Design a protein around this ligand. Structure first.
Ligand SMILES: *C(=N)[C@H](C[C@@H]1CCNC1=O)NC(=O)[C@@H]1Cc2ccccc2CN1C(=O)[C@@H](NC(=O)C(F)(F)F)C(C)(C)C
Ligand SMILES: *C(=N)[C@H](C[C@@H]1CCNC1=O)NC(=O)[C@@H]1Cc2ccccc2CN1C(=O)[C@@H](NC(=O)C(F)(F)F)C(C)(C)C
Ligand code: NA
Ligand code: NA
Ligand code: NA
Ligand code: NA
Lengths: 306, 306
């Protein structure tokens, strides 16, 4: 029993973290085989932040302008290239702790674990979702850039996020591991801001199912609803529309609990219209939307990783 | 910016986890140097659960009754002993990934990271507090016993919890790594239950300070209060009494924010009397009490571990 915001075990990623320095700027890199991945803004100077031309800044650098440290050991940079907003530093040594891994670009509403790091050293691990507005509500301080987000599947670390910037509302923006930003954000100093966000409906539904699995039914009702009629209410409360694909993904949880998806939608509708009335669900007084259907199955079934 | 329920990086503990089997019962063990620590109830049979005599059950076992597997590798048990409610299995091989470590018995109100494990394999990591009633609100399924809770300090893993039992309210009980239960719980099938719990006041105060550090002051007021008068209100809302020791521990956070501890207590009083009025603090509609003062400093300052 119990339901927690659960991160993946971080060890396979801890062994990949390094420190990268260029000029006066130090941040984190990811060391996989003989390449070190990091945000290209490490090559920026505080003077050319408004409109840096990165191709122009990088052609002026040599391999020896980059200091890469793994633990106490310096790694010698023997090659470098830019791919979108990430720099790839080829180093003389292949990481002996390189796990089986993939690079993945996730969709909004998907969750991942973040290993917050400073000066190449892990600080902590927590679970986040990619919001519909392509920000994440992380916890990141100066020096955290290059920290990565990831999922694990059996043996395989799927890296999906590298941290680059904090927006004025204090939420966070970054790239996939190929250096493409999520959302419309850029790695320059501009007036950019998080767009209006919405609640991830399919995830709230997954979490209502977790609550039932964990022996709590108080919020259920006898009604049902149509997808169309539910989406009319969703829209009204700033919830993402629920698609038939979402309904199908919620199938296994519907089946394990005996509650049809559209019946759970009716319960959610009533919760949005009436509130919780000072009651809680899985210890929360708010409707939680940073658990996916897969996250619920994983933690209510005890899937492990090898 | 940001504030998350942040666990310690789990890698140093992942490398210590093994699987222990005795009879038909399999659960997790902790492998440090040449000893494997696990719950002694692994030696129980489903018949003798109400009132097992463990000394009597254990004298009937031999080393070869215990199967210990690390990864794919079997470790041969060459000695065994019982220490309170944990079994110590001496094995032929010293764990080469043994970190620097300590065993610590924590006080209620302290937090730790839990590495949930099944069949010797880590499943996930999350943050918990030892409640005043000496339970933890974990997330644990069949097979999770032997999973450990820990803190990390620089290089040093301080193990503080090993999981043994789930109580009828779905909260969890276990031991320090020397096998002494927290609270009055026992490893037998009896009518035991969680006592009434209280809210960890010094932690709610720490988290109000985190919220201020992160740029939110809406809940502050101009008033102050006396410790005595605050504790009268605490008692009324089922909060733990605040001691002068708690006040002193909150010193660094008071100093960084410029809000005297007793002034923050006045704010907390008003929040208890008036509620939040549909507002949130650090994303929560409830007063959070599973961050310690040290947890707040750690995550608002970015301490790392080596
Ligand atoms: C990386 N170490 C750091 C992570 C930040 C610092 C505070 N919390 C975080 O998550 N990233 C930055 O400081 C980036 C780097 C950068 C590259 C190009 C142009 C400008 C910058 C400055 N950075 C910012 O995150 C700044 N925010 C923005 O520029 C904007 F809001 F996105 F527009 C700022 C946090 C104000 C320094
Ligand atoms: C360990 N693998 C398991 C962890 C449990 C299972 C479900 N969630 C958990 O956290 N521990 C047990 O099953 C223990 C073992 C045990 C030892 C001695 C006597 C009885 C037991 C049965 N266990 C329980 O946790 C049971 N609860 C209680 O006995 C009591 F509530 F504490 F009294 C029960 C969960 C009902 C199996
Ligand atoms: Na630079
Ligand atoms: Na319903
Ligand atoms: Na047994
Ligand atoms: Na005050």
């Amino acid at each position: 029993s119990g339901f927690r915001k659960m991160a993946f075990p971080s060890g396979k990623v801890e062994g990949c973290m390094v420190q990268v320095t260029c000029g006066t700027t130090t941040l984190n890199g990811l060391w996989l085989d003989d390449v070190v991945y990091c945000p290209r803004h490490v090559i920026c100077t505080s003077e050319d932040m408004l409109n840096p031309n990165y191709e122009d800044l990088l052609i002026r650098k040599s391999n020896h302008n980059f200091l890469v440290q793994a633990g106490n050991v310096q790694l010698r940079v023997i090659g470098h290239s830019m791919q979108n907003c990430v720099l790839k530093l080829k180093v003389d040594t292949a990481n002996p702790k390189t796990p089986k891994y993939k690079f993945v670009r996730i969709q909004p509403g998907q969750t991942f674990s973040v290993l917050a790091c400073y000066n190449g050293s892990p600080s902590g691990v927590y679970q986040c979702a990619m919001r519909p507005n392509f920000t994440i509500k992380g916890s990141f301080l100066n020096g955290s850039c290059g920290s990565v987000g990831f999922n694990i599947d059996y043996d395989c670390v799927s890296f999906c996020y590298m941290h680059h910037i904090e927006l004025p509302t204090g939420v966070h923006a970054g790239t996939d591991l190929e250096g493409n930003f999520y959302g419309p954000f850029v790695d320059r100093q501009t007036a950019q801001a998080a767009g209006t966000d919405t609640t991830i409906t399919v995830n709230v539904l997954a979490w209502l199912y977790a609550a039932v699995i964990n022996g709590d039914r108080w919020f259920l009702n006898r009604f049902t609803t149509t997808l169309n009629d539910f989406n009319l209410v969703a829209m009204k409360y700033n919830y993402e529309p629920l698609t038939q694909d979402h309904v199908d993904i919620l199938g296994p949880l519907s089946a394990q609990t005996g509650i049809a998806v559209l019946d759970m939608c009716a319960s959610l509708k009533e919760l949005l219209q009436n509130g919780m009335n000072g009651r809680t669900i899985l210890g929360s007084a708010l409707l939680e939307d940073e658990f996916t259907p897969f996250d619920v199955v994983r933690q209510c079934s005890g899937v492990t990783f090898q």
